[PDB]
Amino acid sequence: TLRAAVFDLDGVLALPAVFGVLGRTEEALALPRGLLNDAFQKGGPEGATTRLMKGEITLSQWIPLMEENCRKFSIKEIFDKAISARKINRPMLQAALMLRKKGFTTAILTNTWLDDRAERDGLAQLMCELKMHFDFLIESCQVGMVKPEPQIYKFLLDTLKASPSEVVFLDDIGANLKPARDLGMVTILVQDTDTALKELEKVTGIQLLNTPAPLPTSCNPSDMSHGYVTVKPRVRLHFVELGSGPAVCLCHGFPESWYSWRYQIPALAQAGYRVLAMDMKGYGESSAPPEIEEYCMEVLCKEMVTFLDKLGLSQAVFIGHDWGGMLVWYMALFYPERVRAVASLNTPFIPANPNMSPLESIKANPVFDYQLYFQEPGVAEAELEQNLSRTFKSLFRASDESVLSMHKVCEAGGLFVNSPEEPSLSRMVTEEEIQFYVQQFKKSGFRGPLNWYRNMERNWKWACKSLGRKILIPALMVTAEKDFVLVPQMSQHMEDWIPHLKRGHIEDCGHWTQMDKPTEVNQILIKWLDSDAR
């Protein structure tokens, strides 16, 4: 009965195999067949390559020793190109992910080297992306043992804490499968991926080939780097941070969390960006002062500028959703020198109407009735804090799962009045994800978050100062077909204010854009970032 899956790297999790380049070179340079591949293995267990793979010497030390073996054109150049060309075998990783998702312990067991080349980062990035999807990574150069030595196999089993018969082992080198087979492990010789995966699904009884497109990698809160900046005496801001490159500040909506970006954080970091996923003021681990004035856009934006000041960041690209999207447009209007680029999901840019009170403007739209219900301090807090699991389960649902009516909320005297006490779990979320939001809202409740709605006049007066301005920095507006509150048509006039505005549109997408359509959100954001945010 299988419970562990082991994969080789070269020719298995990463393709094309670096081993099959010596032969490729021979053919291209019309060299005697197997000349380079023979130099590579010269001396066998006593040879330079075994010393390299055991970690006795580094790759830069091995390069000249290989050159001496070849003289039975550059070895460095051949290997630099082979390593650069080698990329993740996505269907193999998909299978490993599905196996781990089903309860399997997974490991990469690889014959590798200590890379000290000037271009070592490329491989470092590859190992990083790959390894975080596995329980263990066993490298020959770190353990001082190599496949096919039987000791590395006993080391693998001790690491897995599993009997050989519980382990499936995948490798492209037949000689490296033999010791695992001899111990009683299920083995798979990997030539083409499809066949290897058919063999894998046959032995495990788990569908691995032709399966639906998986969701992007999410975040485990306990595995993130958590950051804290005090922006003023009584206010600290919490954020989750991942990746390197240009800073990308993610701003959630109401009533959310940094975790609402769980599907974007790993994808944007992988894309070459330094992601800072905020807990906005009033939320999660960030401070939640009680005063209403603490949540007007002018103060919220000033604190986000201080946040950048304290971190030593001259700029960040600002990406917001819902109330976070509203904040990012004001960041672009009032602090363009600090905003590298601005993007909003669902939230359109609507200039203040100087000839109408914001209270009047909100009364004009029937979908915005819930906002008037939110005005009186304590009323909405009571209903939203009564049962947290019910609040999040009722709120976080796809366009076709609605249990809420946001019309005549005041008249009915509640957001959840003719809504169930025990809502069914939406297909967008797990019970554990709901419980994360529940645990977060137990710290400060809904006062700070609802205070974001209690500054209409204050925000209106501040916004009026920007009525003569235009947004001329790079900007992206992403609309969601099925958001019935922040409707796509509400954004129709944006290019009058943002002439160079770029757009994205997500069909069959509700309000909770990031979790409703994670793959498409990531595709739109990464594409825009690489073209407009450097």
Ligand X SMILES: O=C(NCCC(c1ccccc1)c1ccccc1)n1cccc1
In the bound complex, what is the minimum distance in angstroms from residue 497's beta carbon to a copy of itself? 12
Residue 133 or 363: the one with the smaller Cβ distance to ligand X is: 363
Residue 261 interaction partner, one of ligand X, a copy of itself, none, beta carbon < 5-8 Å per kind: none
Binding residues for ligand X (CB under 6 A): 253-255, 322-323, 326, 347, 370-371, 395, 483-485, 511
8 belongs to an annotated ligand binding site: yes
Are 293 and 455 in contact, with CB atoms under 8 Å apart?
A: yes
Among 472, 484, 492, 519, binds a copy of itself (CB under 8 A): 472
Residue 212 interaction partner, one of a copy of itself, ligand X, none, beta carbon < 5-8 Å per kind: none
∠ CA 232-244-283 to the nearest 5 degrees?
35
Residue 257 or 347: the one with the smaller Cβ distance to ligand X is: 347
Residue 63 or 456: the one with the smaller Cβ distance to ligand X is: 456
How many positions of this chain bind a copy of itself (CB under 8 A)? Answer: 58
Give the per-residue contact string, 330-349, with a copy of itself (x = CB under 8 A; - = no).
----x-xxx-x---------
Residue 220 interaction partner, one of ligand X, a copy of itself, none, beta carbon < 5-8 Å per kind: none
- Cα–Cα distance, 256 to 323 (Å, whole number): 10
201: how many CB neighbours lie within 10 A of its CB? 18
172 belongs to an annotated ligand binding site: yes
Which residues on neighbouring strands pair with residue 532, listed in sequence order? none
Residue 134 or 512: the one with the smaller Cβ distance to a copy of itself is: 134
The catalytic residue among 171, 279, 322, 369 is: 322
Contacts of 90 (CB under 8 A, 6+ apart): none
Contacts of 325 (CB under 8 A, 6+ apart): 251, 253, 344, 345, 346, 347
- Cα–Cα distance, 367 to 484 (Å, whole number): 8
Residue 254 interaction partner, one of a copy of itself, ligand X, none, beta carbon < 5-8 Å per kind: ligand X
- Cα–Cα distance, 250 to 248 (Å, whole number): 6
What are 447's two structure tokens? 């006062």
- Contact status: 313 vs a copy of itself (CB under 8 A): yes
Q: Residue 341 region, left (φ>0) first, then alpha (ψ -120 to 50), else beta?
A: beta
Task: Establish whether 322 is a catalytic residue.
Answer: yes
Residue 394 interaction partner, one of a copy of itself, ligand X, none, beta carbon < 5-8 Å per kind: none
513 belongs to an annotated ligand binding site: no
- Binders of a copy of itself among residues 17 to 76 (CB under 8 A) are 51, 55-58, 60-61
Contacts of 140 (CB under 8 A, 6+ apart): 53, 54, 55, 110, 111, 112, 146, 147, 152
Among 165, 469, 493, 507, binds a copy of itself (CB under 8 A): 469
Residue 395 interaction partner, one of ligand X, a copy of itself, none, beta carbon < 5-8 Å per kind: ligand X
How far out from the chain centre does Cα 404 lie? 30
111 belongs to an annotated ligand binding site: yes
- Binders of a copy of itself among residues 102 to 121 (CB under 8 A) are 114-116, 120-121
The catalytic residue among 259, 273, 373, 453 is: 453
- Contact status: 130 vs a copy of itself (CB under 8 A): no
Residue 189 or 485: the one with the smaller Cβ distance to ligand X is: 485
In the bound complex, what is the minimum distance in angstroms from residue 317's beta carbon to a copy of itself? 12
- Name the H helices within 112-192: 121-131, 140-143, 150-160, 174-182
318-338 per-residue burial string, b: 16 or more CB within 10 A, e: under 16: bbbbbbbbbbbbbbbbbbeeb
Query: Would you give the DSSP letter of residue 13?
Result: T
430 belongs to an annotated ligand binding site: no
- Nearest to residue 321, comparing CAs of 260, 268, 267? 260
- Binders of a copy of itself among residues 191 to 230 (CB under 8 A) are 222-230
- Nearest to residue 7, comparing CAs of 82, 86, 85, 88? 88
Query: Omega into 16 within 30° of 0, i.e. cis?
Result: yes
Residue 275 or 384: the one with the smaller Cβ distance to ligand X is: 384
- Nearest to residue 305, comparing CAs of 290, 296, 315? 315
Residue 455 or 522: the one with the smaller Cβ distance to ligand X is: 455
Task: Establish whether 453 is a catalytic residue.
Answer: yes
* Torsion angle of the four alpha carbons 492, 497, 499, 505, in this order, in degrees rounded to the nearest 10: -30
Task: Establish whether 158 is a catalytic residue.
Answer: no
Residue 248 or 251: the one with the smaller Cβ distance to a copy of itself is: 248
In the bound complex, what is the minimum distance in angstroms from residue 68's beta carbon to ligand X? 38
Query: Would you give the DSSP letter of residue 426?
Result: P
391 belongs to an annotated ligand binding site: no
- Contact status: 161 vs a copy of itself (CB under 8 A): no
Give the residue ranges of the annotated binding site for Mg(2+).
8, 10, 172
Residues acting as catalytic residues: 322, 453, 511
Give the residue ranges of the annotated binding site for substrate.
370
Give the residue ranges of the annotated binding site.
8, 10, 110-111, 172, 370
Give the residue ranges of the annotated binding site for phosphate.
110-111
